[PDB]
């Protein structure tokens, strides 16, 4: 029954083709509500959920100004980390940043987080105490020394357990009808012969919110985790999510396998067994 607010940033350099591409997205739980794309027409932070639209012009001015400032630092950091890693000015590189906070069902602060990546690998991350950093390599330790000297953690922590928590509380209230819902998974099982002696059993989970879910296959009660195909959780487009897990079974032994489903909205964990004549 916990909630979260998270902001995702991506900066991709475009050598010889102008300024980097900057895309920022804000999410409350698994619901996106804000967006900034440097290639979009408006060049403002834009609403992406109905309950945030009620915010006033000054809110969008402040969000536009602050998210642009993130872009400027990411643009600088791309050049700086190019030096740290001794790389050419011809190649395109990527910086990704995620930060946010978690609150419990009563609104109390639970955890803050900030994580940075360079070219798809870990660069630097804030620790759970929000007082210290963990660099991923010796290049990132140069950044760690800079942020430790400027005391970036203390300033960031005030946002992560203060501003972030209070505005997460406000968003949850302004959009309670949509954000405080838990859609349990609609589950079913499909069967697909691949021959006259083998068949694919597929376990489905559709229309659930939030996105966290677990699908597990068991043969005779024992797990089959290394013979299981499990695709990424995917959005349906209406605010819900889908996932499936598959196992190849010998024909006539389908009743030996069971799919187990775990989700926030389920009273008890569901157990699905294929049915035969």
């Amino acid at each position: 029954g916990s909630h979260s607010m998270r902001y995702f940033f991506t900066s991709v350099s475009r050598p010889g083709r102008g300024e980097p591409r900057f895309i920022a997205v804000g999410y409350v739980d698994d619901t996106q509500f804000v967006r900034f794309d440097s290639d979009a027409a408006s060049q403002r932070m834009e609403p992406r959920a109905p309950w945030i639209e009620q915010e006033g012009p000054e809110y969008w001015d402040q969000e536009t100004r602050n998210v642009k400032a993130q872009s400027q630092t990411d643009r600088v950091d791309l050049g700086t980390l190019r030096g740290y890693y001794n790389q050419s000015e011809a190649g395109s590189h990527t910086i990704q940043i995620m930060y946010g906070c978690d609150v419990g069902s009563d609104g109390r602060f639970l955890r803050g987080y900030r994580q940075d990546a360079y070219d798809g690998k870990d660069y630097i991350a804030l620790n759970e105490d929000l007082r210290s950093w963990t660099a991923a390599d010796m290049a990132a330790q140069i950044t760690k020394r800079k942020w430790e000297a400027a005391h970036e953690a203390e300033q960031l922590r005030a946002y992560l357990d203060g501003t972030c928590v209070e505005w997460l509380r406000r968003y949850l209230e302004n959009g309670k009808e949509t954000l405080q819902r838990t859609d349990p998974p609609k589950t079913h099982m499909t069967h697909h012969p691949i021959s006259d002696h083998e068949a694919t059993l597929r376990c489905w989970a559709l229309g659930f919110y939030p996105a966290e879910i677990t699908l597990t296959w068991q043969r005779d009660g024992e797990d089959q985790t290394q013979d299981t195909e499990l695709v990424e959780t995917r959005p349906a487009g209406d605010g819900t999510f889908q996932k499936w897990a598959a196992v190849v079974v010998p024909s006539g032994e389908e009743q030996r396998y069971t799919c187990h489903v775990q989700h926030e909205g389920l009273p008890k964990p569901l157990t699905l067994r294929w049915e035969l004549s």
Binding site: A24, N66, V67, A69, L81, I124, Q155, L156, T163
Partner: peptide
């Protein structure tokens, strides 16, 4: 809301 401007570079 996003964090306020003023973070130092990497």
């Amino acid at each position: 809301v996003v964090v306020g401007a003023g973070g130092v570079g990497k």
